[PDB]
């Protein structure tokens, strides 16, 4: 399968998540995603075919994971934007007030701004600290998806937020949204990963 940020993948034929970013670890291909999406050795599938397995993850505390892929996977330095793509150029971290977009299998590509950093989300499973908050909307299924600036600087992967009864926070004003992502920087260093860029 072609690995692009924002597309759907399933875990052990059950849950769905979104791909964050294509990366490599030496000769190994992978993608970064949300920790809450799977446990170590869980099976990742894209369009019904097995593409790899969870190599590692941290959740709760943090919300991160990387999936090692088989060799036949094609890593691409891109993030889905409808039918078009945003080119991954690096990982400079943007500051509070910067505009950012996020891509995922449920609500597609949504943009907004970063409103706060170092937020704690109290999930039922336990607290997740150090999240950055934006006001782009998202829905169930978007987790693990890419957060990127229009300039191509990768920011992190979708963790969670304040979803309403319809499954997203797209029906509430930007001012009331709390959409949290895990920073990409600590995930790349923690696993020794390099981002695929174009």
């Amino acid at each position: 399968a072609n690995i692009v940020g924002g597309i759907e993948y399933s875990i052990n034929n059950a849950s769905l998540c979104s791909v964050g970013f294509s990366v490599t670890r030496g000769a190994t291909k992978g993608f970064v995603t949300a920790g809450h999406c799977g446990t170590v050795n869980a099976t990742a599938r894209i369009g019904g075919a097995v593409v790899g397995t969870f190599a590692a993850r941290v959740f709760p505390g943090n919300d991160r994971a990387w999936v090692s892929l088989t060799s036949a996977q094609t890593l691409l330095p891109r993030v889905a934007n409808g039918s078009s793509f945003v080119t991954v150029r690096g990982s400079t971290e943007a500051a509070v007030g910067a505009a950012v977009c996020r891509s995922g299998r449920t609500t597609g590509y949504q943009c907004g701004t970063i409103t706060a950093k170092n937020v704690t989300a109290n999930y039922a499973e336990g607290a997740v600290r150090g999240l950055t908050q934006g006001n782009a909307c998202m829905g169930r299924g978007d987790s693990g998806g890419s957060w990127i600036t229009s300039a191509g600087q990768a920011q992190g992967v979708m963790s969670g937020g304040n979803v309403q009864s319809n499954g997203n926070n797209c029906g509430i004003p930007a001012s009331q949204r709390s959409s949290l992502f895990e920073r990409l920087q600590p995930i790349l260093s923690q696993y020794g990963l390099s981002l695929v860029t174009g």
């Binding site: 959740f59 109290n122 999930y123 039922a124 299924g141 978007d142 963790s159 969670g160 709390s178």
Partner: peptide
């Protein structure tokens, strides 16, 4: 807040 929920994970996703």
């Amino acid at each position: 807040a929920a994970p996703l």
